[PDB]
């Protein structure tokens, strides 16, 4: 009854940040030692809990959120952070309890001539609430006149493509990010550690 962290991290395909994928972990024992002892991660930062004590605690609901972002945007995946990705794609709460893991994926998510499948949300009327997921593709009204569904003067498509290339700098190279959130609500603690 091992927790299926393999199919999240070792997955072949990753979702876009605006449509970040979410998996839930329940009714299993999680060996976190396999995670924090593997040095294949560029960033591994935990808030409200350390990687060690994770192996000695239990939680009711744990969520792995997987997506792909830019390198220089990995800083935005943190509590109390502002920026395009944080404000419009993925927002973490101030009281966040959990870990953020990010590793470079240039060899997997970059291609010659540009990989344009990954997209991020560029504009929104209001800031994104924590863990809120928005996949609407309506035209963003950027001023006085309405758009009626067309682009132009103060009328832009909210979603823009990344365009990852292998020869780009480390700040432009794609990074795969998994956010592990452990909540421990008033519920049975289905996940535990050895």
């Amino acid at each position, epitope marked *: 009854n091992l927790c299926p962290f393999g199919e999240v991290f070792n997955a072949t395909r990753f979702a876009s940040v605006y449509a970040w994928n979410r998996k839930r972990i329940s009714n299993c024992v999680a060996d976190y030692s396999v995670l924090y002892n593997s040095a294949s991660f560029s960033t591994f930062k935990c808030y409200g809990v350390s990687p060690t004590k994770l192996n000695d605690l239990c939680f009711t609901n744990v969520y792995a959120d997987s997506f792909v972002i830019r390198g220089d945007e990995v*800083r935005q995946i943190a509590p109390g952070q502002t920026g395009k990705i944080a404000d419009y794609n993925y927002k973490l709460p101030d009281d966040f309890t959990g870990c953020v893991i990010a590793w470079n994926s240039n060899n997997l998510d970059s291609k010659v001539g540009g990989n344009y499948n990954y997209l991020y949300r560029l504009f929104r009327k209001s800031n994104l609430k924590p863990f809120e997921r928005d996949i609407s593709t309506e035209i963003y009204q950027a001023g006085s006149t309405p758009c009626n569904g067309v682009e132009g003067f103060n009328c832009y498509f909210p979603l823009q493509s990344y365009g990852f290339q292998p020869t*780009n700098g480390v700040g432009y190279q794609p990074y795969r990010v998994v956010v592990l959130s452990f909540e421990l609500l008033h519920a049975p603690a289905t996940v535990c550690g050895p």
Partner: antibody
Framework: EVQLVESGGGLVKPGGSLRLSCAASGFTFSSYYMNWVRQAPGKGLEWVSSISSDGYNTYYPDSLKGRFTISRDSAKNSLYLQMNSLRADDTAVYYC?????????????????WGQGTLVTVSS | QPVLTQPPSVSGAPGQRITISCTGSSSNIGAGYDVHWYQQLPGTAPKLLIYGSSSRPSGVPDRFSGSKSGTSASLAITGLQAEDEADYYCQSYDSSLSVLYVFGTGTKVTVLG
């Protein structure tokens, strides 16, 4: 059309600190990575520092031991390099450079445009 | 780690073709990163001459060409001119956050005759 003008160079005592400024014009300032490079008199070229377009990411080589700091200002379209614990080996002509466009294949890898450069001399 | 190596100086008479080598490692050039070439006239700042290891910006004549293969790169100048006497620097990128931009040694080109 792309202008990069440096200022702030001069004499600085060993162990002291100095700030170099670089004004940029002719392009969307907040859309390009910016860099500082240096060249000792009669010597080669060494990359000194780099900053992302938004300005929240900083990159330095380990040789400088973290005594250099790069910042950017879009309210003045300027780029600043602060140098601390300076020594005679840091005496060089410093150039501020603009990286390649983000919509190219060599983004954040080179120095498309260069400034006139300013001479920083560390002496007692 | 730590720099790219170039011949200290390459010389040639006006008319022929000369080449400047740029020897990198598996960390910068063999890692899939392109090479750039900058030309510095005496008393002036460096100017971009070749980017993408084979592409020239506006104002660079076809006499300048670039190539890369394996862990090495090369810059070729065909039909040498007296105005080409200058310092030529190659440059590449390293994925390691402690290195990143790797600069070449630099080659002084002089024209004979």
């Amino acid at each position: 059309e792309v202008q990069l003008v440096e200022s702030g160079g001069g004499l600085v005592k060993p162990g002291g600190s100095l700030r170099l400024s670089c004004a940029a014009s002719g392009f969307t300032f907040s859309s390009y990575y910016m860099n500082w490079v240096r060249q000792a008199p009669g010597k080669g070229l060494e990359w000194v520092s780099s900053i992302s377009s938004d300005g929240y990411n900083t990159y330095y080589p380990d040789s400088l031991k973290g005594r250099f700091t790069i910042s950017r200002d879009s309210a003045k379209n300027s780029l600043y390099l602060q140098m601390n614990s300076l020594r005679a080996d840091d005496t060089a002509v410093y150039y501020c450079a603009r990286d390649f466009s983000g919509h190219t294949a060599v983004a954040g890898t080179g120095f498309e445009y260069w400034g006139q450069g300013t001479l920083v001399t560390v002496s007692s | 780690q730590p720099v790219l190596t170039q011949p200290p100086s390459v010389s040639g008479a006006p008319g022929q073709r000369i080449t400047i080598s740029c020897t990198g490692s598996s960390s910068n050039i063999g890692a899939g990163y392109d090479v750039h070439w900058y030309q510095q006239l005496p008393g002036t700042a460096p100017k971009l001459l070749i980017y993408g290891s084979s592409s020239r910006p506006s104002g660079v004549p076809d006499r300048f060409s670039g190539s890369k293969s394996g862990t090495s790169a090369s810059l070729a100048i065909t039909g040498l001119q007296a105005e080409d006497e200058a310092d030529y620097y190659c440059q590449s990128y390293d994925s390691s956050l402690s290195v990143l931009y790797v600069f070449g040694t630099g080659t002084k080109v002089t024209v004979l005759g």
